[PDB]
Write a protein that binds this DNA or RNA. Structure first.
Ligand SMILES: [Mg+2]
Lengths: 592, 1315, 49
RNA sequence: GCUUUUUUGC
DNA sequence: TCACAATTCTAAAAGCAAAAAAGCCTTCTC
DNA sequence: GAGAAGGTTTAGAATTGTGA
């Protein structure tokens, strides 16, 4: 039965390889038996015994020696050893990694209304995973008498099974797992919430942990059965008990892109807006001004706020005062938990500012307020990001006026150096290096020109003479606020996209003077392709090597457990801040 | 000019560059090759003629009875393409070759044949290429992808610095033949010259020379120049050429003519040799110390003792010098050896070798090749002669010979494929020359070294292999048997040839299953060149440099279309204009530019030949006659973009569209995307699934028309004419008489295809696109296949997108769709699923198909005929019954989930089983449609004959009134004179008779073909196939994309009352996230959105001025104004030549936005987009001001709306969802099955176990790999406990562990568990 | 669970122990593997005492 | 219910 | 003797998923 | 027809080939 002969479809039998090898060895043993019985001459008995030795050598470990035996197909057949070793033997395929019941798979989409510990699970899938629990509760409630009747009832989907299912789904965590589970946070327990649809709805704030956007990914959900399993999912894995990375201290609930844009745009300031300068009794008045159109979400306003400093040991002490903020910062203040100080929400909240704000919440107050705070931050970010209507158009990326002149001057300079080479006064290598240098200079100059143009583009007047403020451009906001992108990408979108590297590392001597809001001619695009294909090949052929490295590391260090309280030794390591020639790279505080 | 079918919708066409060469026929790559494969070929260089001429004539061991070649013919298919798909059998043709066996006489080299026996012998079928480039092997439609490999030749590689751990530069010289053995010459850190064959054990090089009829003197003469020492009265005066001294030190006093020319201690330089040659120095004295440092060239033997004085290639020492000095010989030949300009590599190699003679060389090679067998002189001689110098076993292809000669700077291109001694020694000398410093290595990425196979060449090689196996068989048999008795066919038997061809086509790494869910998918699955396959590299061993893009792929291979994944850069796609050379190498066209004037003669340039010239740039402004307006133009001289003067150019590029494949040329504004986004867009536009009602792009590139027509999807007219009868199932076109043949009174019938399954389970139908009485000219479409619209290529719908964040329902890549799109079925598709019931004859009772089913009531029986089979048109759901079949309960149940009607049933039964009643009904139905359709094929010919009778029967005793009394037939026996008129009447009667005969003779065969059974699998009664046809809607989870790589998964279907609405009331239809664009820099999508808004604004203006009727004058004025807008736009449509009825049809085809064509790299600009926006009434910035549906308040920050073209990719959420609670388990290891077809469970791989260990969840892990998976008694107890109400487990121990335990035990390794 | 067995008419060498590289039998009998496999495959005679 | 080949998604 | 050092041979090369098609010995014979 | 029936890319360890 460990090598079955299964009648395939209709009328034929599929013989496993081992049956072939055993048949061959039995045949050739019978031949040797007869030959030794008849006492044949020496040469043929030698040949027969040799070839029996060969048949067994193929049986136990095929193809170890030359001329691996092949069956019907041209390929070698699999022996015992090849049935144990390798990536398809029992050790890596059926013992360490098993297929598992009570488990489904589906696309993941975004449900932006769930709480940080919930996942929307479809009704069809959920009803199919929790079938035995449904049978149990039907039997216990008596609505069906026997498992046959219960099975028919669930298979026909009467009107009662839905309320039964909503009962058996109440406090029953389910493990969501994304395909290449890379680190500890790729498996997480979640509270199901039944959904009508066929996609698993996954709270946005956990995507970063999973490294999962919604370009059509897929997750597998497993169900814990027993009580230890349910408590373990609830106490160890649940998505609220995992808000710090294990590899370092940094939190793993950084609000990512739309929410950070909403908070940034909300909590900004502009030198003139509706309702500038008035005084508001508190945050609530700020909200009911902004919601009625009488003032702008960001207009400079004095507001009377009360912050709770907990200087008293485990006791909050209130402090009332007047602050200079905007309507946006007061509205956002309405959600921050008690013990925080007001200066923590009183600047344009980028991504770093928000992440440290969550970190300080976690540090001062603990866990539960931080979970509530992360939820409220997501909701407010999404709402006011939507209300901003922050869109992107072609006019939101402006070529600097000076780029024409800069590129013309660099053209003149390279013409001068080329003429210098025509006279032989400059060696080839020096000519090349100097051309590269002047082009790098031109690129830097034009990039700074466009950044100066964008970063303060807006010019506006309060009641008279003009004034300069940071610019409300859409793409500048997308990059500055940390939402999505950096300065290099915006440089390519507006200023010239520098020089490009031939695949051998050589830098070509003709930069791409044309950005993307203008065209690239055919040749510039071809050069860009050199650059891009290199990177794609890198990722494709690097994922495999990384996986192998991680496998080796785990299979070495898979025995360390923390077993004792103090081994009682005085040795150690002398840690000091590291210095790589220049300044101190890693300071002592982070080191120790 | 304009057609009368391209005049229904004219694409307002931006783009300034007037292209000269039209886009070629995109399928030529495979059509031409397989045309060459089968062609009755005089002079037989390629095709089957080449194979037969190569393998024949066959000669026995002077058996005086030999066989030769005459001719070969391909018969006709037993089945045309469509019934080959319907049935399942290969669309083939039989091959018949005219063999001729001739029996000589005794002692008859001069003796005439005594017997000649000739016939056609039948050897096997060969599959044929349908007119679309595809093959039909067993019903399914396969494509034999091209292959890119290394052209045979000689290649001098470096192995630059990654050897010996000291930065040495080895050098290698490989010979790659077309069929034979690789021969490699290579170097060693110790500076030896080694050889190897077949990459197996290595040897000193010179041994092969020792095997080529050589002695050491010849070798030394070959690879060295001699230096003359002359023993003289004063210490060996020496004869010196000045040029042998450059870059050397002064080891002595260079003196002559009683004068010291150069002194010791200094070093010889250029001026020194200048002084020497000016003075014409002949001989120079030198001390013996320098003479001691050379090696003797020739073996020197004493004239007295007849014994060796000094053998060759050994250092001359003072002792040997003394011994030979008095030997009497005054001339010594040594070897010039400068460590820079030369090297004695062959000398040390001759030191190393263990051989001395030809016998030693041959035995060494033979021990090298086949160990175990002791050497034999004759066997080794035969082997080394057969390994390289027997054309039957080794062969450079003619391309191989061309590359071989070109590399070695030879002068002819023709040659002989068998190697020669001269060629080997010349390769050796070239390799050494590279080593010395002169000459440079050849890389392997160059498209000069890489060569395209095809269906023709691959098929020829397979047929040749089969045929040489067969000629071996006939040769073996022909030396035996009585010759005069046997006809020349009873020895071939044809089995190997058919076996080989069928095996290559059916199952090969390149003859692969067709991608058929578009016209684009097919037309770009055919122009694919694959680096892989037999005779090519492989994905794992595939390097990292081949995957990169060489600077010479410009114009030959696309840079931005390659499937990322394991094989990225190994599967290339062939560029638009690229054609293949006479040899295999890729050309691209180029305009000839003699002087500054850019002449209009196009020359195709290959890969190697493209480097020498300096080729201008496709977009270099020229002013109406062809002078490059600019002073410094750009060019690409030799793989190096550079800047050249106004006149150095020797070629220009044909078109700006020539660097990109077809699939990447349908993306508008390609020159604004990043390269990665362009790649992903080109790759997803090939997965778009065709929807119910096709919609034109509305921002295109003008390549949609060519792509749509250049696939075989659309039924295009062969001879123009006037439509005569249109229908959803056929079209009948009356050919214009001018184009008509001299006779046969032809018309054209087109049988549109209706609701058939594609390979990917999609619906391929064809809708007529012409009205009745409509004139259709030659080459104009009639039927719009899937995703086609008026002969364009409509892959998706154009939807009103707005870019903004909307409550995080479009967070990362998600899309937020309106319910207005689900309502209208914009993205609804039709899938067709072919289920099969195979009715075998099992034991314990031969099976049946009776409708009688035990153990069922009437719920399942209410959807069946009395034979059990389902009525065609019956909606079914999961778990129903479709075919009646019970055990002596194998009834084909509808698998779970698959739904929808049953559009088609087909039953094949083998000859021998009585057809059942529904088989009777179906075959009778098919017979009736056959008879009807092939009576419809009768036409006005007979009526024309009757009219001819009437014209000839004008009078002469004729009843003019009674002509129409009786039917027109009896017009022959009526009264007539006795002249030629009566003879003509009899001739018309004869015509009538043979008309009956000719139509009846053809009509009979259909009875035979329909009636007969067909070849099933042995043992099966009949195959019954049902065809369900589900219809998929859109829903959350369904993946959607644009053309610029901006994919995403639908997240919410939002009610129309909630979408943002601009002030005019019109709700937005999709909402996309802006935050995507700046990071993944695809600015193409924004520009497409703005141009779409402009175009739909123009279309709205036309629809307003048309619906609220205004006279045609205003319409022609406005349409003309829209068609002018621009600058140097090359189109220039003249609208005053339409006659106020073509304008009305046109303007009725423009009420849904005016289409635009924006070619790939010289598309529209910002300024012209703004102009077009102004021509409507829309704001110029592109951004309008939107209101929020849910709250009605206005959005700050104006938002970007427009019309973007959205596709629907074939990754549907309902084919991905899957769940399992308990099902069936595998047999060996009792673990759940894997897959969605099987009710399978999700794998819990290793990495997830590591995650669980890291958390510390030990109980979850234990229940995860003991109960839920594998412990049999444990999981049954678990199920029982769960149903009961108690949540607990008794784990036990796996049953996939005991398997391992026993398999290790069945080795000799006792493994056991202890206390 | 129930196995079976086959009685070889003559002895035979276990490949795993013979050519594990390093080889157990080889360095247990202090004599190379080329000749050991040559003897095993009936191509030489090996003396004992 | 097993092996291979090909393709595609992440 | 006994030591480098060159040649040979074995071991490995991410994970999950879906689809599709192939497929199960030559010959020798009554 | 069909039953018989013998059929790359690197690295690490191990050998032996001069070279002392
Ligand atoms: Mg993704």
């Amino acid at each position: 039965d460990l090598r079955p002969l299964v009648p395939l479809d209709g009328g034929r039998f599929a013989t496993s390889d081992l049956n072939d090898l055993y048949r061959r060895v039995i045949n050739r043993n019978n031949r040797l038996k007869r030959l030794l019985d008849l006492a044949a001459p020496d040469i043929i008995v030698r040949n027969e015994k040799r070839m029996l030795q060969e048949a067994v050598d193929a049986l136990l470990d095929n193809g170890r020696r030359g001329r691996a035996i092949t069956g019907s197909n041209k390929r070698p057949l699999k022996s015992l050893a090849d049935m144990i070793k390798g990536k398809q033997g029992r050790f890596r395929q059926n013992l360490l990694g098993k297929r598992v019941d009570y488990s489904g798979r589906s696309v993941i989409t975004v449900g932006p209304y769930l709480r940080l510990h919930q996942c929307g699970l479809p009704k069809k899938m959920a009803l199919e995973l929790f079938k035995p629990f449904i049978y149990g509760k039907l039997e216990l409630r008596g609505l069906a008498t026997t498992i046959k009747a219960a099975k028919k009832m669930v298979e026909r989907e009467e009107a009662v099974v839905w309320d039964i299912l909503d009962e058996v789904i109440r406090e029953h965590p389910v493990l969501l797992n994304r395909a290449p589970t890379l680190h500890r946070l790729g498996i997480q327990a979640f509270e199901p919430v039944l959904i009508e649809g066929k996609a698993i709805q996954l709270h946005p704030l956990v995507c970063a942990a999973y490294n999962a956007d919604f370009d059509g990914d897929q997750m597998a959900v497993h169900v814990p059965l027993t009580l230890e399993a349910q408590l373990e999912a609830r106490a160890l894995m649940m998505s609220t008990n995992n808000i710090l990375s294990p590899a370092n201290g940094e939190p793993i609930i950084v609000p990512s892109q739309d929410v950070v844009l909403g908070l940034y745009y909300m909590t900004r300031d502009c030198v003139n807006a509706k309702g500038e300068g008035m005084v508001l009794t508190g945050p609530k008045e700020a909200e009911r001004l902004y919601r009625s159109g009488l003032a702008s979400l960001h207009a400079r306003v004095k507001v009377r706020i009360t912050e709770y400093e907990k200087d008293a040991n485990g006791e909050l002490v209130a402090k009332t005062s007047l602050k200079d903020t905007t309507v946006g910062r007061a509205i956002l203040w309405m959600i921050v938990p008690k013990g925080l100080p007001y200066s923590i929400v009183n600047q344009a909240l980028g991504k770093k500012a928000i992440s440290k704000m969550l970190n300080t919440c976690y540090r001062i107050l603990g866990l539960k307020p931080t979970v509530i705070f992360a939820d409220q931050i997501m909701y407010t970010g999404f709402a006011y990001a939507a209300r901003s209507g922050a869109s992107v158009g072609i006019d939101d990326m402006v070529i600097p006026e000076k780029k024409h002149e800069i590129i013309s001057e660099a053209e003149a300079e390279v013409a001068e150096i080329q003429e210098q080479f025509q006279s032989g006064l400059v060696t080839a290598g020096e000519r090349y290096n100097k051309v590269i240098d002047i082009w790098a200079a031109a690129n830097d100059r034009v990039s700074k020109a466009m950044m100066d143009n964008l970063q303060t583009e807006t010019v506006i007047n309060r009641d008279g003479q003009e004034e300069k403020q940071v610019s409300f451009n859409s793409i500048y906001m997308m990059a500055d606020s940390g939402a999505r992108g950096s300065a290099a990408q915006i440089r390519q979108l507006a200023g010239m996209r520098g020089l490009m590297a031939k695949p051998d590392g050589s830098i070509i001597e003709t930069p791409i003077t044309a950005n993307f809001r203008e065209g690239l001619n055919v040749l510039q695009y071809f050069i860009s392709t050199h650059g891009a294909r290199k990177g794609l090949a890198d990722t494709a052929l690097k994922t495999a090597n990384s996986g192998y490295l991680t496998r080796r590391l785990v299979d070495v260090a898979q025995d360390l457990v923390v077993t004792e309280d103090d081994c009682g030794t005085h040795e150690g390591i002398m840690m000091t801040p590291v210095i790589e020639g220049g300044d101190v790279k890693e300071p002592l505080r982070d080191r120790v | 000019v304009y057609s009368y079918t391209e005049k229904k919708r004219i694409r307002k066409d931006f783009g300034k560059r007037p292209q000269v060469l039209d886009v070629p026929y995109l399928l030529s790559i495979q059509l031409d090759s397989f045309q060459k494969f089968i062609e009755q070929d005089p002079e037989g260089q390629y095709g089957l003629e080449a194979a037969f001429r190569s393998v024949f004539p066959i000669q026995s061991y002077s058996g005086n009875s030999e066989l030769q070649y005459v001719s070969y013919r391909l018969g006709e298919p037993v089945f045309d393409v469509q019934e080959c798909q319907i049935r399942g059998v290969t669309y083939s043709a039989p091959l018949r070759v005219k063999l001729r066996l001739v029996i000589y006489e005794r002692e008859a080299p001069e003796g005439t044949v005594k017997d000649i026996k000739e016939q056609e012998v039948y050897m096997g079928e060969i599959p044929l290429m349908t007119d679309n480039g595809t093959f039909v092997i067993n019903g399914t439609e396969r494509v034999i992808v091209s292959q890119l490999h290394r052209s045979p030749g000689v290649f001098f590689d470096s192995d630059k610095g990654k050897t010996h751990s000291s930065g040495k530069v080895l050098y290698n010289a490989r010979i790659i033949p077309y069929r034979g053995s690789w021969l490699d010459f290579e170097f060693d850190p110790k500076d030896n010259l080694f050889v190897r064959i077949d990459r197996r054990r290595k040897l000193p090089a010179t041994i092969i020379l020792r095997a080529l009829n050589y002695t050491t003197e010849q070798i030394l003469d070959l690879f060295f120049e001699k230096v003359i020492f002359e023993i003289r009265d004063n210490k060996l005066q020496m004869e010196l050429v000045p040029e042998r001294l450059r870059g050397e030190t002064a080891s002595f006093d260079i003196e002559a003519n009683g004068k010291v020319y150069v002194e010791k201690g200094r070093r010889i330089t250029a001026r020194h040799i200048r002084q020497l040659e000016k003075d014409d120095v002949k001989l120079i004295e030198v001390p013996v110390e320098y003479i001691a440092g050379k090696v003797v060239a020739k073996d020197y033997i004493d004239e007295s003792t007849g014994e060796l004085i000094c053998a060759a290639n050994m250092e001359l020492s003072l002792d040997l010098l003394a011994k030979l000095s008095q030997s009497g010989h005054k001339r010594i030949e040594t070897l010039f050896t400068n460590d820079l300009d030369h090297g004695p590599y062959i000398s040390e190699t001759l030191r190393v070798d263990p051989t001395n003679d030809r016998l030693s060389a041959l035995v060494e090679i033979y021990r090298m090749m086949r160990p175990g067998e002791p050497p034999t002189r004759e066997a080794a001689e035969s082997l080394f002669e057969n390994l390289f110098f027997s054309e039957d076993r080794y062969d450079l292809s003619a391309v191989g010979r061309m590359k071989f000669n070109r590399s070695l700077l030879r002068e002819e291109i023709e040659g002989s494929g068998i190697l020669s001694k001269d060629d080997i020694i010349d390769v050796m000398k070239k390799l050494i020359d590279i080593r010395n410093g002169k000459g440079e290595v050849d890389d392997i990425d160059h498209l000069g070294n890489r060569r395209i196979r095809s269906v023709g060449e691959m098929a020829e090689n397979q047929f040749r292999v089969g045929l040489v196996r067969v000629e071996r068989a006939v040769k073996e048999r022909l030396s035996l048997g009585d010759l005069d008795t046997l006809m020349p066919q009873d020895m071939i038997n044809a089995k190997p040839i058919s076996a080989a061809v069928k095996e290559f086509f059916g199952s090969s790494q390149l003859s692969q299953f067709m991608d058929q869910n578009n016209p684009l998918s097919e037309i770009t699955h055919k122009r694919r060149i694959s680096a892989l396959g037999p005779g090519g590299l492989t994905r794992e061993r595939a390097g990292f440099e081949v995957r990169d893009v060489h600077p010479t792929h410009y114009g030959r291979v696309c840079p931005i279309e390659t499937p990322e994944g394991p094989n990225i850069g190994l599967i290339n796609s062939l560029s638009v204009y690229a054609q293949t050379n006479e040899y295999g190498f890729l050309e691209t066209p180029y305009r000839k530019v003699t002087d500054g004037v850019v002449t209009d003669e196009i020359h195709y340039l290959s890969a190697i030949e493209e480097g020498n010239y300096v080729i201008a740039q496709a977009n270099s402004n020229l002013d109406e006659e062809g002078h490059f307006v600019e002073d410094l133009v750009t060019c690409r001289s030799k793989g190096e973009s550079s800047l050249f003067s106004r006149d150095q150019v020797d070629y220009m590029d044909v078109s700006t569209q020539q660097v990109v494949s077809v699939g990447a040329s349908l993306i508008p504004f390609l020159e604004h995307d990043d390269a990665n986004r362009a790649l992903m867009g080109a790759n997803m536009q090939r997965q778009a699934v065709p929807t119910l009602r096709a919609d034109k792009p509305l921002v295109g590139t003008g390549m949609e028309r060519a792509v749509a027509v250049d696939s075989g999807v659309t039924a295009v007219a062969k001879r123009g004419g006037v439509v005569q009868y249109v229908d959803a199932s056929r079209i009948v076109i009356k050919v214009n008489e001018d184009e008509m043949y001299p006779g046969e009174a032809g018309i054209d019938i087109y049988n549109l295809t209706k609701y058939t399954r594609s390979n990917q389970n999609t619906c391929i139908n064809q809708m007529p696109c012409v009205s009745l009485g409509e004139p259709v000219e030659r080459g104009d479409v009639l039927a719009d296949g899937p995703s086609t619209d008026l002969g364009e290529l409509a892959l998706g719908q154009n939807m009103r997108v707005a870019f903004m964040p909307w409550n995080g329902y479009n967070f990362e890549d998600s899309i937020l769709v309106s319910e207005r799109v689900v309502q209208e079925d914009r993205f609804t598709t039709i899938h067709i699923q072919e289920l099969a019931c195979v009715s075998r004859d099992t034991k314990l009772g031969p099976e049946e198909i009776t409708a009688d089913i035990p153990n069922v009531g009437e719920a399942a029986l209410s959807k069946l005929d009395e034979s059990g089979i389902v009525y065609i048109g019956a909606e079914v759901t999961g778990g129903d019954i479709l075919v009646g079949k019970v055990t002596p309960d194998s009834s084909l149940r509808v698998p779970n989930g698959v739904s929808g009607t049953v559009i088609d049933v087909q039953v094949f039964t083998r000859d021998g089983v009585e057809k059942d009643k529904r088989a009777l009904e179906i075959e009778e139905m098919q017979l009736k449609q056959a008879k009807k359709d092939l009576s419809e094929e009768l036409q006005i010919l007979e009526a024309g004959l009757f009219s001819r009778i009437r014209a000839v029967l004008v009078a002469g005793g004729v009843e003019a009134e009674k002509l129409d009394k009786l039917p027109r037939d009896r017009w022959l026996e009526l009264g007539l004179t006795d002249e030629e008129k009566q003879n003509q009447l009899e001739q018309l009667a004869e015509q009538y008779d043979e008309l009956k005969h000719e139509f009846e003779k053809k009509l009979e065969a259909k009875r035979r073909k329909i009636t007969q059974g067909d070849d099933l699998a042995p043992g099966v009664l009949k195959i019954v196939k049902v065809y369900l046809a589900v219809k998929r809607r859109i829903q959350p989870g369904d993946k959607m994309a644009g053309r610029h790589g901006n994919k995403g998964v639908i997240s919410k279907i939002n009610p129309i009352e909630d979408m943002p609405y601009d002030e005019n009331g019109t709700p937005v239809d999709i909402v996309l996230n802006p935050l995507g664009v700046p990071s993944r820099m695809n600015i193409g999508q924004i520009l497409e959105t703005h141009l779409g808004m402009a175009a739909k604004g123009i279309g709205d203006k036309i629809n307003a001025m048309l619906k609220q009727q205004q006279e045609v004058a205003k319409l022609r004025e406005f349409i003309q104004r829209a068609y002018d807008l621009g600058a140097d736009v090359r189109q220039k449509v003249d609208l005053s030549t339409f006659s106020d009825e073509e304008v009305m049809r046109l303007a009725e085809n423009l009420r849904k936005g005016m289409p635009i064509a924006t070619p790939v790299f010289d598309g529209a600009k910002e300024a012209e987009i703004k102009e077009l926006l102004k021509l409507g009434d829309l704001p110029t910035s592109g951004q309008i001001r939107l209101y929020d549906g849910r709250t009605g308040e206005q959005f700050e920050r104006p938002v970007t709306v427009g019309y973007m073209y959205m596709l629907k990719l074939n990754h549907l959420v309902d084919d991905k969802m899957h769940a399992r609670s308990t099902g069936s388990y595998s047999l060996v290891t009792q673990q759940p099955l894997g897959g969605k077809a099987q009710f399978g469970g999700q794998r819990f791989g290793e990495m997830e176990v590591w995650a669980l260990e890291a958390y510390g969840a030990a109980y979850t892990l234990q229940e995860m790999l003991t109960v839920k998976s594998d412990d049999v008694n444990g999981r049954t107890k678990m199920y029982k406990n769960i149903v009961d109400g108690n949540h607990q487990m008794e784990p036990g121990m796996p049953e996939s562990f005991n398997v391992l335990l026993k398999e290790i035990r069945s080795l000799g390794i006792n493994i056991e568990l202890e206390d | 669970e129930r196995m079976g067995h086959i009685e070889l008419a003559s002895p035979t060498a276990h490949i795993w122990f013979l050519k594990s590289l390093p080889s157990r039998i080889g360095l247990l009998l202090d004599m190379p593997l080329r000749d050991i496999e040559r003897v095993l495959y009936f191509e030489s005679y090996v003396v004992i005492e």
